[PDB]
């Protein structure tokens, strides 16, 4: 299957409460492997998956130096953005950054990402061609001109289409037991009266990995795309995911509905019916 | 592994 590596960074200003909060998290596919928190005791990049603990001190010194350098960049960027938007130091503001790479089943590069948000709105992003920038507004156009004048894109492309892929391949081989696995969903149905004349049917998928799944409800074999409640896919806390999909049905015609479960871990898609 | 770009906004 296809794989990805992503880093997510959140910088939050804290008026009169000292330095901004900085949080960095690294993922391979739907597995977290590293964190940094400005407010934690270590002041180190920290492992969050057993396979990355195999990496030696040169790895960890390097990642710690790089993540501390990002924290300092974002501290200045909070100040810059206040200048660009004529905003005082009294308010709390948020910078978000994300970057990473996707590979196919052959572990060859598919695409890269580098993008920022300010107070929950798109700010600047590298375009899919890796050669140009999309700028949300006039402040972002100031950033874009600085990055164009300094030829930042060629340095960034070198990481996204090269270094990033090399790291991901290294992690996929060293983490193969954790990362190159599929856990098929354990499924079941619940039944609740909402009226004297209708009931909720709830299709459950539990303990699955990776997070991508499709739950669909059919009424006499037709998709209920308008009439289905689906919750957000949610972490179990043990490295697996959970989801459910519900339909409200005429009480006594439960047996007319089918739930359909599709996941990379299933040899064939599952069908479930209410069994009272 | 993290990117090493020095660029500021």
């Amino acid at each position, epitope marked *: 299957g296809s794989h990805s590596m992503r880093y997510f960074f959140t910088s939050v200003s804290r008026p009169g409460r000292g330095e901004p909060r900085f949080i960095a998290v690294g993922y391979v596919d739907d597995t977290q492997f590293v964190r940094f928190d400005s407010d934690a005791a270590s002041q180190r990049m920290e492992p969050r998956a057993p396979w990355i603990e195999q990496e030696g001190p*040169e790895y960890w*010194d*390097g*990642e*710690t*130096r*790089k993540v*501390k*350098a990002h924290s*300092q*960049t974002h501290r*200045v960027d909070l100040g810059t953005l206040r200048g660009y938007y004529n905003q005082s130091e009294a308010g709390s503001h948020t910078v978000q950054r994300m970057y990473g790479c996707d590979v196919g089943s052959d572990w060859r590069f598919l695409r890269g990402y580098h993008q920022y948000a300010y107070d929950g709105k798109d700010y600047i992003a590298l375009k899919e061609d890796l050669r140009s920038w999309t700028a949300a507004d006039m402040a972002a156009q100031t950033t874009k001109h*600085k*990055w164009e*004048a*300094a*030829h*930042v894109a*060629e*340095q960034l*492309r*070198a*990481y996204l*289409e*090269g*270094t990033c892929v090399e790291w991901l391949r290294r992690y996929l081989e060293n983490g193969k037991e954790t990362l190159q696995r599929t856990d098929a969903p354990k499924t079941h149905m619940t039944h609740h009266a909402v009226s004297d004349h209708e009931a909720t049917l709830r299709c459950w998928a539990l303990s699955f990995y990776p997070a991508e799944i499709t739950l669909t409800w059919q009424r006499d074999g037709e998709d209920q795309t308008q009439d289905t409640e689906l919750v957000e896919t949610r972490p179990a806390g043990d490295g697996t995911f959970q989801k459910w999909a519900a339909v409200v049905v005429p009480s006594g015609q439960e047996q007319r509905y089918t739930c359909h479960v599709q996941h990379e871990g299933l040899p064939k898609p599952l069908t479930l019916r209410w069994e009272p | *592994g993290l990117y*090493d*770009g*020095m*660029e*500021h906004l």
Partner: T-cell receptor
Amino acid sequence: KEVEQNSGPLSVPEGAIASLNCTYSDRGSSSFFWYRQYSGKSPELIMSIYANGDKEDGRFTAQLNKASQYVSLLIRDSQPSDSATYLCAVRGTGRRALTFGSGTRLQVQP
Amino acid sequence: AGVTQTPKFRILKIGQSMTLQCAQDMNHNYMYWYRQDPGMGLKLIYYSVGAGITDKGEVPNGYNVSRSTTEDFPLRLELAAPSQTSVYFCASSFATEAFFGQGTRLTVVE
């Protein structure tokens, strides 16, 4: 130590290729540069490279081999006015300043 | 429209103090001081990643710097010693290219 170049002088006949080489210790280094310094003058960037492969800019070629931790500059059709010190500069893992080699003095003989 | 470093030349007697001026008008976050002895490479004295932030390089003993402002990165020599006879370069960067000042040739005399 961190960035190694032969100090030369490197004597090259006019019209021949001058071959300048550089090795670096930090395997994770991201950014590689050639700087040219005329006698008594300041260093001036002449080539930037970030990925494995080669880059041309007129008579200059830079090539980066990250697996061998080796960086090269070629000067094709070398002229006496190319006579200068060539400094390899490398940015190490998580560094925010350049580390310079001690330079190779190139002497293109007429 | 670049890095303005003064003075070009200076004589100090042993124990005297001086300030080397460095200014840039490019709004660069990163500034640097290097020294270069005869026929040798650049060594980092001090660098700054932004206003109010300064850190030690490879050869900091002898010197002090301040980055009150984005534009200015003065280098203070506190107590001139003969080992400090050298050429001093100020540089700025946005991210990639390091832009060098004209340099300061300092001789310390008994």
